[PDB]
Amino acid sequence: KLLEHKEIDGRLKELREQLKELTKQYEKSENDLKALQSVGQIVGEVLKQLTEEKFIVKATNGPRYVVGCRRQL
Amino acid sequence: RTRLLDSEIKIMKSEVLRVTHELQAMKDKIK
């Protein structure tokens, strides 16, 4: 009628706002879970180009390796 | 009356929304 749920709408809005913020953190957490599947990569410097798909690289910890190259790079 | 039915419908919707939201939003964080 004249009043209806206009006055009661205040309680619903307050409850929804508090619960709405909780779901926001869930999106943030998912970002972390998307990083747990990314592993590290050894770091070394290129020494020479034997061929188009073969390189001589020495990891800056240990030995010298002959390794390939990613196509896109 | 005409607004009596509307009030009952709104109350029923609120109960479902509160239960449904917890079962989905809260579960994702805990999982």
TrEMBL record, chain A:
Signal peptide: none annotated. It is found in: Cytoplasm; Nucleus. Residues 1-39 form a coiled coil. Belongs to the AAA ATPase family. This is 26S proteasome regulatory subunit 10B. It comes from Homo sapiens (Human). The chain holds residues 29 to 101 of 403 of the full protein.
